Amino acid sequence: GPSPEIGQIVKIVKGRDRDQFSVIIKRVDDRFVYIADGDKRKVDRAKRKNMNHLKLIDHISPEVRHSFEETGKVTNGKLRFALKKFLEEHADLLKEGE
Ligand SMILES: [Cl-]
């Protein structure tokens, strides 16, 4: 199975923000990660999640990864922009959402 990566997009399967997209910002191991989206869940409220409660998406933000590699942190706004790029790719899949 694919191993979760820093900067990788997830869809939340179970949790407060079920069905919403988020970003992995820390990997404990392949079972537990921390997520934040910079909006509904800010970095200082990052949530520890069991991977059973997440769907890994095939999208990884190099900008988020760089921020962590160099400095060990990321801003909320950089997470929002990472998610926005994902949303832009899939706009036509999502445009009938209400
Ligand atoms: Cl959640």
Side-chain angles (χ1 to χ4, degrees), residues 31-44:
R31 290 179 56 245
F32 293 96
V33 300
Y34 286 78
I35 66 167
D37 71 346
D39 190 20
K40 290 172 279 240
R41 185 172 299 289
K42 302 283 191 181
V43 169
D44 75 339

Side-chain angles (χ1 to χ4, degrees), residues 8 12 25 40 50 57 68 72 74 80 84 86 89:
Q8 187 162 12
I12 300 163
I25 66 163
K40 290 172 279 240
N50 192 301
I57 298 304
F68 275 104
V74 70
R80 294 196 304 271
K84 185 173 182 282
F86 169 77
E89 176 176 349

Side-chain angles (χ1 to χ4, degrees), residues 9 28 31 43 60-61 70 80:
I9 307 303
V28 181
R31 290 179 56 245
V43 169
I60 301 170
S61 169
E70 294 292 342
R80 294 196 304 271

